[PDB]
């Protein structure tokens, strides 16, 4: 459980530590630390120091247009379509890996994404107009 | 119904793909020596806290023949090697007609040439001879009194390395950058490449050192179990083989010349560092092998070749046919000199269905060389003043074809490393790195206020 | 025997030992090439 101790757990016990996942992933690999500095193994840790932020900032940036700015789980308002998955309730939570469900929603995980930003912040931030001050 | 989404920050997930890494080693020899080959003059130390977790119920399917782990180790040690003899003394104005004779053997092997020719002095008005040695196969007959040549001159140009670069290889960690993880089998027999059911995902690999061997690997990994065999594809025999050694076999190599730094200075600053007068007798290089521990090995090898080879036909060890005498001869780096240890005596042996001698090899030494067949730019290695040895483990074999057999029986593999990226397969079989998602998505009863 | 914009010459240059010179007729351009001072040098 230090880190991905969960990867073949269930989707439940894996998500009652997905903060150590979280945490690890930025902060990681120790980055911090002749008379030349232009040798190959520095630009190979600048690079891959760049892919570092904005790979997290990639990421980050979606979390802010959905409200969860500071929150490693949101609900969202956003209703589940069927067709995305037949399973119920305790189908999926209590048998499948993040593994096998990483698959099973990789054809239609841009359909999600476009949807989520619309109803839980492109009209929740709007609804305000009539409820700010009135 | 009525079920709605959620998202999850932080979900273990990932894609097979592969981005830069990095060097990890720590404090090693700064002071008592420095300007290291490999290391470089600095690199990212490591922690002493090994990075590792046990990943359980998890069975990822690893690749190692088409691992690009291996792909940016080749390259990154072809750049490396290129970037620490940039600045170091070239040697162009040592083409010039050589005369030599052989040296003195009172009068009756030879293998090395007393040889002069003249040179660039301090000031380009003046030229200076002086008389230097030289080895066979660096140089090559032009057309009495022998006359000769740099066979480098013919094909590419020189540059000598520096006397005071460190050519030890030491153990260069390569870490994962943030956002992936390298994935590490702990399947004990990993037979070729499939799905590894014990898996560690670490962030820091082992102490991997950069050993530049050919047919024969020393200082390699192994973890147990009979003598592993790998290969990319085991029916076509055009495809060569890795062997790992359940047990290592104590070799030493060494020189027994007695060498000389002559100093000559050419040019304003840069001296040429070449081979004096060989003090105390004159005898051959040679590398020892224990007779009785290789006998052993042969044995293990070809236990487990056997059920992987029908266990029917012939074993038919020969000497590495063909070929070329740096590819097929053990070649290898060791004190500074380049050694090239005869092979073809350690194979002879064949074994079919059911204070100690120890054999030994000769091996020859050469300055001029331009490694995996690189003709971009050639270097000269200063021969290393003093006494030599070399004293390594032996963990690898590398085995190539047995011929274009039909059907029939009686085949096995002679040695041959025609490729250097293979050298380094031999310690990373087991890792891949895979780019991991933190984002996903799963529905659940669940929602937030109504109106925000 | 008699437009021209081109010359059949030659030079002596460098071979792969800096002890010995060779001799090689090349050819070259006009413009590429304009005078210094019976045979043009
Ligand atoms: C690998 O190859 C290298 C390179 O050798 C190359 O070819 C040889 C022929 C020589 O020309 C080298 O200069 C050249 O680079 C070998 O290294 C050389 O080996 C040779 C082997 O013969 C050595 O030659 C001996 O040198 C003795 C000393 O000479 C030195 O100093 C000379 C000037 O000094 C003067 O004053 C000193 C005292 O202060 C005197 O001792 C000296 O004689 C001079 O009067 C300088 O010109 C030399 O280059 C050298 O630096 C010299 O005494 C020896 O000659 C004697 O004795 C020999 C037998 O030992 C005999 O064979 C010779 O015929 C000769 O007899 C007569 O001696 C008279 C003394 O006055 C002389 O006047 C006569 O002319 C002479 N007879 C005739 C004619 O020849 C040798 O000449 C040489 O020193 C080495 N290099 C150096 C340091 O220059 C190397 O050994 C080879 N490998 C191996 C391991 O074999
Ligand atoms: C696979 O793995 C194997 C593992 O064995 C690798 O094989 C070999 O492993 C050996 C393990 O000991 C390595 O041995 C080391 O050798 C170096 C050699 O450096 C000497 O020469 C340097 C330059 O020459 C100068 O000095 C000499 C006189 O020696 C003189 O003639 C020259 O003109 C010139 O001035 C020197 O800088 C250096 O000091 C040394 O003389 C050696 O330095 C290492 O030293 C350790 O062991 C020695 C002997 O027991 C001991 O004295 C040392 O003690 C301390 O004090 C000395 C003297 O002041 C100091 O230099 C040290 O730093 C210490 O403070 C020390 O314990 C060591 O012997 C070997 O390099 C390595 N490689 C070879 C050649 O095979 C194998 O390489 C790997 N795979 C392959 C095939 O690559
Ligand atoms: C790395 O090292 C390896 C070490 O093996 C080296 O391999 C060498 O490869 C070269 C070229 O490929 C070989 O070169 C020649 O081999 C000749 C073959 O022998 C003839 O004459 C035989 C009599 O020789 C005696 O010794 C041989 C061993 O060489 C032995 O088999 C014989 O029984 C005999 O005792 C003759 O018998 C043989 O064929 C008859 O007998 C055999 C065996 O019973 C039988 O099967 C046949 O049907 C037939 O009846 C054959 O006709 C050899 O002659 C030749 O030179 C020899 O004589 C000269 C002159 O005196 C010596 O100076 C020299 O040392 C030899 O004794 C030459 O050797 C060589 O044999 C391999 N191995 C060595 C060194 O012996 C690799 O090339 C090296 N790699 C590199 C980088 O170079
Ligand atoms: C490791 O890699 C190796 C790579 O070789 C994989 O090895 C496989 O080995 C098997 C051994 O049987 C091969 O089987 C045959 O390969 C033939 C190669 O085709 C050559 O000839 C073709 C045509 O040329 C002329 O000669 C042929 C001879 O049969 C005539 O039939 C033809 O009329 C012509 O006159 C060329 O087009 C081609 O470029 C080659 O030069 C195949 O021809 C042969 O096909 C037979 O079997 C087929 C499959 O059942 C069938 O569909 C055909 O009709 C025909 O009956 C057959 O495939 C494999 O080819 C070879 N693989 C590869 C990549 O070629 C090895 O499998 C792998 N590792 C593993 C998994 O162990
Ligand atoms: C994820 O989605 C992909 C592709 O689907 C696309 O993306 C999604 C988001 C939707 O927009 C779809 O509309 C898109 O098309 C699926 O990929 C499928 O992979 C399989 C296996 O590789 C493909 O099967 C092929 O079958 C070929 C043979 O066709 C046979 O049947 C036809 C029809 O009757 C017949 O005409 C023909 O003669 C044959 O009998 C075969 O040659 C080929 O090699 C391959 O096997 C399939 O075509 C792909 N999908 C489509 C519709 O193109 C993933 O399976 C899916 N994964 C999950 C988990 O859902
Ligand atoms: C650089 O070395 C070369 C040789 O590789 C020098 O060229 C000539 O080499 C010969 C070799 O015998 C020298 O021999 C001398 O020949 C003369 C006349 O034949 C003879 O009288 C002497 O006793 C001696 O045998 C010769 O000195 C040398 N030069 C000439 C003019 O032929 C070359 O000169 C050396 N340095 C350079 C590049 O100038
Ligand atoms: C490691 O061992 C496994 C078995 O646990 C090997 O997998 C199996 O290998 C055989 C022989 O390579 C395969 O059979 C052959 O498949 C090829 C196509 O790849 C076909 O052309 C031949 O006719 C034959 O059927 C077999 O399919 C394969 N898989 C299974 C599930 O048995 C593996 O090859 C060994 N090597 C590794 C990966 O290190
Ligand atoms: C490799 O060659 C060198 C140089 O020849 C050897 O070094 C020499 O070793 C001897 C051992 O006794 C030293 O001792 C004595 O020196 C005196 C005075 O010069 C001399 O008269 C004696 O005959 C004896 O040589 C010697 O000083 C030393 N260096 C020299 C200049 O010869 C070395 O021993 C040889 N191989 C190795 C590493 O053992
Ligand atoms: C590189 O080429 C040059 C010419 O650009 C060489 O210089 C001299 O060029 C003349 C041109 O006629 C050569 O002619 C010879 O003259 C002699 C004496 O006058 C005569 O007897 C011959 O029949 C012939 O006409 C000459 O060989 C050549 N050298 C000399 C010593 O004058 C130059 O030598 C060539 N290579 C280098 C740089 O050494
Ligand atoms: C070499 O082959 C023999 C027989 O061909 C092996 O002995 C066993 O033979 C039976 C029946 O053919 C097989 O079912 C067994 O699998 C074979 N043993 C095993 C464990 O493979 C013999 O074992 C083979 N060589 C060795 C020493 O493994
Ligand atoms: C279970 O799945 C079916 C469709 O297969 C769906 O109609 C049903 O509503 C699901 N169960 C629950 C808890 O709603
Ligand atoms: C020197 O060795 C060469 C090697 O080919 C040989 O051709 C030559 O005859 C030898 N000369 C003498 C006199 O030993
Ligand atoms: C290598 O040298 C060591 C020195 O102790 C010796 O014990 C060992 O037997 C040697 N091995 C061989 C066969 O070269």
Redesign the interface.
């Given at each position: 459980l230090?880190?991905?101790?969960?990867?073949?757990?269930t989707?439940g016990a894996?998500?009652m530590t997905?903060?150590?996942?979280?945490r690890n992933?930025?902060?990681?690999?120790?980055?911090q630390?002749?008379l030349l500095?232009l040798?190959?193994?520095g630009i190979?840790?600048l690079?891959?120091?760049v892919?570092?932020?904005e790979?997290?900032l990639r990421?980050q940036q979606?979390?802010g247009i959905?409200?969860?700015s500071g929150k490693?789980?949101?609900?969202?308002?956003?209703?589940?379509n069927?067709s995305?998955?037949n399973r119920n309730?305790s189908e999926?939570?209590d048998n499948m890996?993040?593994?096998q469900?990483?698959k099973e929603?990789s054809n239609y995980?841009q359909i999600?994404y476009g949807l989520?930003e619309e109803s839980q912040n492109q009209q929740?931030k709007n609804?305000?107009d009539l409820?700010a001050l009135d | 119904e009525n079920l709605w989404v959620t998202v999850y920050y932080g979900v273990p997930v990932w894609k097979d793909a592969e981005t830069t890494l990095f060097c990890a080693s720590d404090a090693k020899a700064y002071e008592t020596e420095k300007h290291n080959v490999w290391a470089t003059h600095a690199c990212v130390p490591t922690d002493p806290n090994p990075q590792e977790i046990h990943l359980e119920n998890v069975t990822e399917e690893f690749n190692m023949w088409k691992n690009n782990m291996v792909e940016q180790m080749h390259t990154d040690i072809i750049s490396l090697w290129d970037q620490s003899l940039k600045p170091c003394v070239k040697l162009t104005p040592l083409c010039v007609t050589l005369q030599c004779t052989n040296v003195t053997n009172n009068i009756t092997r030879t293998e090395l040439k007393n040889c002069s020719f003249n040179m660039t002095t301090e000031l380009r008005d003046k030229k200076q001879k002086v008389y230097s040695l030289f080895y066979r196969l660096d140089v090559v007959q032009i057309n009495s009194n022998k006359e000769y040549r740099l066979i480098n001159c013919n094909t590419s140009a020189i540059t000598q390395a520096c006397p005071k670069v460190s050519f030890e290889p030491i153990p260069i960690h390569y870490c994962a950058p943030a956002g992936f993880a390298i994935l590490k089998c702990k399947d004990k027999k990993f037979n070729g490449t499939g799905p590894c059911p014990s898996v560690s995902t670490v962030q820091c690999t082992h102490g991997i050192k950069p050993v530049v061997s050919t047919q024969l690997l020393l200082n390699g990994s192994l973890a147990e179990e009979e003598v592993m065999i790998r290969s990319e594809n085991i029916t076509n025999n055009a495809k060569n083989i890795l062997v790992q050694f359940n047990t290592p076999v104590q070799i030493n190599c060494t020189r027994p010349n007695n060498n000389t730094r002559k100093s000559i200075r050419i040019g304003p600053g840069q001296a040429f560092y070449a081979t004096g007068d060989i003090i105390g007798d004159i005898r051959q290089a040679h590398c020892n092998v224990s007779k009785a521990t290789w006998n052993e090995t042969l044995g293990k090898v070809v236990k487990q070749l056997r059920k992987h080879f029908g266990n029917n036909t012939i074993i038919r060890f020969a000497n590495s046919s063909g070929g070329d005498l740096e590819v097929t001869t053990h070649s290898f780096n060791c004190g500074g000199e380049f050694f090239y240890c005869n092979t073809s005596g350690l194979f002879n042996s064949t074994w079919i269905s059911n204070s100690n001698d120890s054999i030994t090899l000769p091996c020859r030494i050469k300055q001029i060389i331009n490694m995996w067949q690189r003709i971009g730019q050639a270097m000269y290695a200063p021969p290393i003043q003093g006494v030599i040895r070399c004293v390594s483990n032996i963990t690898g074999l590398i085995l190539t074809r047995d011929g274009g057999s039909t059907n029939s029986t009686t085949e096995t593999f002679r040695p041959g490393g025609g490729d250097m990226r293979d050298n380094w397969r031999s310690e990373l079989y087991k890792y891949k790195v895979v780019k991991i998602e933190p984002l996903g998505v799963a529905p659940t009863r669940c929602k937030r206020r109504v109106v925000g």
């Open positions: 230090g880190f991905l101790g969960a990867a073949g757990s989707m894996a998500s997905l903060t150590v996942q979280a992933l930025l902060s990681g690999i120790v980055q630390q002749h500095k040798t190959v193994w190979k840790q690079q891959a120091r892919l570092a932020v790979r997290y990421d979606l979390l959905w409200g969860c490693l789980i949101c609900c969202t308002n956003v209703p589940w069927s995305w998955s309730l999926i939570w890996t993040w593994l469900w990483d929603i995980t999600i989520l929740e609804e305000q409820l | -």
